[PDB]
Homo-oligomer: A and B are copies of this chain.
Amino acid sequence: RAKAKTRSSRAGLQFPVGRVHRLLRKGNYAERVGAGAPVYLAAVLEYLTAEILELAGNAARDNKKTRIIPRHLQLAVRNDEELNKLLGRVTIAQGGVLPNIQSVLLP
């Protein structure tokens, strides 16, 4: 056959299109899975992954750290308003909460 070029490189993506397609078929969702559905799923997951990691990297530089540790991921999710509403019902382990103090609480 021809060269086994990955579908992620064909779509300009890093997330695995085939793994998403395989998990969609074995995940018991529909009788058939379309061709562009894993490509759309990979783009959405990668953009969500890249957005949080960039914000986590921004939070990592705020506390001068070169390694992403779970406090950075929790800080990135809660600081962003859209990530807060998307993950409102989501508990992040080893992350704590935002360090905010009530206005009337200060002396």
Contact = CB atoms under 8 A, between A and B. Distances in A.
A1 B29 CA distance: 36
A28 B30 CA distance: 6
A31 to B, nearest CB: 7
Interface residues of A, number: 4
Interface of A: 28-31
Nearest to A31: B28
Contacts of A29: 28
A88 B29 CA distance: 27
Nearest to A29: B28
A29 B29 CA distance: 7
Contacts of A31: 28
A31 B31 CA distance: 10
